[PDB]
Design a protein around this ligand. Sequence first.
Ligand SMILES: [Mg+2]
Ligand SMILES: [Mg+2]
Ligand SMILES: [Mg+2]
Ligand SMILES: [Mg+2]
Ligand SMILES: [Mg+2]
Ligand SMILES: [Mg+2]
Ligand SMILES: [Mg+2]
Ligand SMILES: [Mg+2]
Ligand SMILES: [Mg+2]
Ligand SMILES: [Mg+2]
Ligand SMILES: [Mg+2]
Ligand SMILES: [Mg+2]
Ligand SMILES: [Mg+2]
Ligand SMILES: [Mg+2]
Ligand SMILES: [Mg+2]
Ligand SMILES: [Mg+2]
Ligand SMILES: [Mg+2]
Ligand SMILES: [Mg+2]
Ligand SMILES: [Mg+2]
Ligand SMILES: [Mg+2]
Ligand SMILES: [Mg+2]
Ligand SMILES: [Mg+2]
Ligand SMILES: [Mg+2]
Ligand SMILES: [Mg+2]
Ligand SMILES: [Mg+2]
Ligand SMILES: [Mg+2]
Ligand SMILES: [Mg+2]
Ligand SMILES: [Mg+2]
Ligand SMILES: [Mg+2]
Ligand SMILES: [Mg+2]
Ligand SMILES: [Mg+2]
Ligand SMILES: [Mg+2]
Ligand SMILES: [Mg+2]
Ligand SMILES: [Mg+2]
Ligand SMILES: [Mg+2]
Ligand SMILES: [Mg+2]
Ligand SMILES: [Mg+2]
Ligand SMILES: [Mg+2]
Ligand SMILES: [Mg+2]
Ligand SMILES: [Mg+2]
Ligand SMILES: [Mg+2]
Ligand SMILES: [Mg+2]
Ligand SMILES: [Mg+2]
Ligand SMILES: [Mg+2]
Ligand SMILES: [Mg+2]
Ligand SMILES: [Mg+2]
Ligand SMILES: [Mg+2]
Ligand SMILES: [Mg+2]
Ligand SMILES: [Mg+2]
Lengths: 83, 99, 104
Amino acid sequence: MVKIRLARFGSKHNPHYRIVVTDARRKRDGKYIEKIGYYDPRKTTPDWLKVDVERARYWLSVGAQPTDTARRLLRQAGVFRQE
Amino acid sequence: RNLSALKRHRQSLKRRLRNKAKKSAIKTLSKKAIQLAQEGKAEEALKIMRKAESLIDKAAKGSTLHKNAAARRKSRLMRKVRQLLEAAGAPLIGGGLSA
Amino acid sequence: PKKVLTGVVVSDKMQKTVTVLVERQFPHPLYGKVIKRSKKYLAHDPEEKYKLGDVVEIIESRPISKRKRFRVLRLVESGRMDLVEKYLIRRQNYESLSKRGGKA
RNA sequence: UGGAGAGUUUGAUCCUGGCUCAGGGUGAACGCUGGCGGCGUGCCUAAGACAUGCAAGUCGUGCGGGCCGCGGGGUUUUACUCCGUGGUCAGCGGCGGACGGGUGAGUAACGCGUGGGUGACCUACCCGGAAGAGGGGGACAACCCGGGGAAACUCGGGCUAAUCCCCCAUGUGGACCCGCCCCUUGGGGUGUGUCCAAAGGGCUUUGCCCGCUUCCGGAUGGGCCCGCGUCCCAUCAGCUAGUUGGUGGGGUAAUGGCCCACCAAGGCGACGACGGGUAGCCGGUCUGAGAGGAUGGCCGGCCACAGGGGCACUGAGACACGGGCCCCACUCCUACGGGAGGCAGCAGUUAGGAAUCUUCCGCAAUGGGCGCAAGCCUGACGGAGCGACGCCGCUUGGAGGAAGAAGCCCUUCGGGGUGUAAACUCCUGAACCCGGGACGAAACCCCCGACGAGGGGACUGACGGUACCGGGGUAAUAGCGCCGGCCAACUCCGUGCCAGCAGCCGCGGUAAUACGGAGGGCGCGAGCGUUACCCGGAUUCACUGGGCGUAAAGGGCGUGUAGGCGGCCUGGGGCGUCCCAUGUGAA
Ligand SMILES: [Mg+2]
Ligand SMILES: [Mg+2]
Ligand SMILES: [Mg+2]
Ligand SMILES: [Mg+2]
Ligand SMILES: [Mg+2]
Ligand SMILES: [Mg+2]
Ligand SMILES: [Mg+2]
Ligand SMILES: [Mg+2]
Ligand SMILES: [Mg+2]
Ligand SMILES: [Mg+2]
Ligand SMILES: [Mg+2]
Ligand SMILES: [Mg+2]
Ligand SMILES: [Mg+2]
Ligand SMILES: [Mg+2]
Ligand SMILES: [Mg+2]
Ligand SMILES: [Mg+2]
Ligand SMILES: [Mg+2]
Ligand SMILES: [Mg+2]
Ligand SMILES: [Mg+2]
Ligand SMILES: [Mg+2]
Ligand SMILES: [Mg+2]
Ligand SMILES: [Mg+2]
Ligand SMILES: [Mg+2]
Ligand SMILES: [Mg+2]
Ligand SMILES: [Mg+2]
Ligand SMILES: [Mg+2]
Ligand SMILES: [Mg+2]
Ligand SMILES: [Mg+2]
Ligand SMILES: [Mg+2]
Ligand SMILES: [Mg+2]
Ligand SMILES: [Mg+2]
Ligand SMILES: [Mg+2]
Ligand SMILES: [Mg+2]
Ligand SMILES: [Mg+2]
Ligand SMILES: [Mg+2]
Ligand SMILES: [Mg+2]
Ligand SMILES: [Mg+2]
Ligand SMILES: [Mg+2]
Ligand SMILES: [Mg+2]
Ligand SMILES: [Mg+2]
Ligand SMILES: [Mg+2]
Ligand SMILES: [Mg+2]
Ligand SMILES: [Mg+2]
Ligand SMILES: [Mg+2]
Ligand SMILES: [Mg+2]
Ligand SMILES: [Mg+2]
Ligand SMILES: [Mg+2]
Ligand SMILES: [Mg+2]
Ligand SMILES: [Mg+2]
């Protein structure tokens, strides 16, 4: 199935991830279906997480499955906040 | 040495037999039905035709034929059987065939 | 869009099939001038309907054989053996180009 | 935000023309030299051969067991026998092993690029919707009993569970024949007939969780087809017999000579067929003013390959690198019968070579497989290690300091040079020492809420006692090339067409700024030179952007085939050409 997961993009000791949609079977850094966010785990800037809940919600609706820290990040942007 | 891809192997040899058998049963039944129609033996020819239609759809149940491969086989068969009783049949036991 | 080409039937010699000759101008990548250039398609003709010289639109289509992947869609201009003749001489020439000559 | 030229044919000249330099680039290697760090990068050759270790498994919440323990029962006691529980092992079964990872050998091909087509198709796991699980039956491992082989391993007999196999039923629905309607290639309806379903498991047990069945849709991935693009040789000119097309079969998820039988005699080529050579293709890279040229190495995408050659099984998917069979070549075992292998996974060894790294740490992060979960596996990966191999940052000190030591070097014998350089005065304080010491990590999980949204909690760091912060604190490596012109920089001695230099032009035949050394000078600087290769200057294959009376170049002349090209006026079409919109042009 298609996943929502992290793609490692920074540099040696400088991790930045792209939050991506992709078939589970790509390499982690290979061709992805759509970037739908980014994550800087060092919080080196004020702007260290970013999602696009609209698209995130889209891919969930067609059954993308997010990895365990992708969903954590998605939640942190209120992808799932329903109230 | 040793894996249990080893297991995967011997499991396959099992399936290789299950499939082979199921499929033999069809070929040999389908032929039998076709030949009963070349003889215009309509009631009996359909009685076999319907059993073979079954063993086919039954094959497709699990991973032997599956699909539209059974549909292929079914069609190919039901064609020849109707077309071979064009030779003065009148489908008697009238099973397999739409009026 | 299934591709549609327009051409000249230059062969009836087959059962349910016509050779169709299709030209295409275009400017030459480096040297500019407009170059003609052509290619023969084998097309599906199930009524053996179209005849030597007819100008037909030919359409992309699901394979009929090796070679045959087009069907003759409609008839544009009926009859004109100049094109056929033009094409015909071109292959007449071929005979010359070899290892001998004279009356050959 | 874009274009520099020079040296060399002559006694001199102008032109033609080649050769050479200056510039940029590099997975480099070689020489002399070598201090720190960050980030990259590192078998170009043998797709040669490979020791050793590790590299794909997981699930007891599908099933039944063996072995080793412990505990509770039925009896008055033993014997026998029943139940519970701990460890362990494989077996049956499910999912994964078709991904990830390696390489570029082959391949000039729908292989790749790009844009389309599929009324000619498939898609496990995932999401949405509709509906369903009622009866019954069977076998094979495990285990038990025997045989055979040295071994790898193998044969026979008996028992048994299941989410293993089958039969009947239910038919939402679907498949197939025939018909009918709408569509229009095999798209979507509809009727009769026929055919086709299912599996159980766990509980904080009646109602939840995880599964199972059929169908319809989505999503992702893929098959196949087509237009167009894709190197050199014509001293390769003709090629083809499944060849080209038809009919009907076979085969497949599906179109197709894909394969087969029969029939017709086609198909292809100078717009380069057939043959030979070479090569993985692209995103991109380098160069260039551009147009071009060159290239495909890191990373990303496609393809192909897994000692060489075939092949099919299983399966959603493979004709499968760590699966199966056969043939070939090697190496190993061998009781001579027969067996065991396959680093182009990570390291590592050897061989070839001018040359290419550690048998390192860790699953903490990201990602993948299985598992309800706990977790397990992961040489993917995250790091560390080696090499100046590249890039970038940084140090070997700063301020003062003579009319100006000493040595060395010139000298017109007065002087001049190295040279504020050193010595020396003061100042700072790379190295080193002490102390604190990270970010990367918040989820899974547990509690509350409702296993939702939301809130609370706990656990977790290979790198690493590193980064960085603070306190101490020492004047602490300089090399290499060049100095005739092109080309920045000249003097002495030695040498005598020798020894030697030399990119090109040319130096050396006793007063050499060209050889060798010295002093000095120029250029770069932890580097500087050399070789090799690429583009450039090279308008020196000229499209941009050249030529042919005598420099190289008009065919000995014609004829006229293909082809190229084509006077003036009107009209239609709108192929070329131009315009707008739009889609594509991933990272
Ligand atoms: Mg298993
Ligand atoms: Mg001369
Ligand atoms: Mg001269
Ligand atoms: Mg001159
Ligand atoms: Mg390094
Ligand atoms: Mg190599
Ligand atoms: Mg391990
Ligand atoms: Mg046990
Ligand atoms: Mg087990
Ligand atoms: Mg070739
Ligand atoms: Mg294409
Ligand atoms: Mg569903
Ligand atoms: Mg038995
Ligand atoms: Mg079953
Ligand atoms: Mg039934
Ligand atoms: Mg090659
Ligand atoms: Mg140029
Ligand atoms: Mg090898
Ligand atoms: Mg092979
Ligand atoms: Mg499967
Ligand atoms: Mg199969
Ligand atoms: Mg495999
Ligand atoms: Mg393969
Ligand atoms: Mg291997
Ligand atoms: Mg290795
Ligand atoms: Mg050697
Ligand atoms: Mg390394
Ligand atoms: Mg993980
Ligand atoms: Mg790594
Ligand atoms: Mg934190
Ligand atoms: Mg954990
Ligand atoms: Mg000078
Ligand atoms: Mg002298
Ligand atoms: Mg000298
Ligand atoms: Mg010189
Ligand atoms: Mg530096
Ligand atoms: Mg040029
Ligand atoms: Mg030249
Ligand atoms: Mg020109
Ligand atoms: Mg010229
Ligand atoms: Mg002359
Ligand atoms: Mg001449
Ligand atoms: Mg003349
Ligand atoms: Mg002449
Ligand atoms: Mg003419
Ligand atoms: Mg004109
Ligand atoms: Mg003309
Ligand atoms: Mg037009
Ligand atoms: Mg555009």
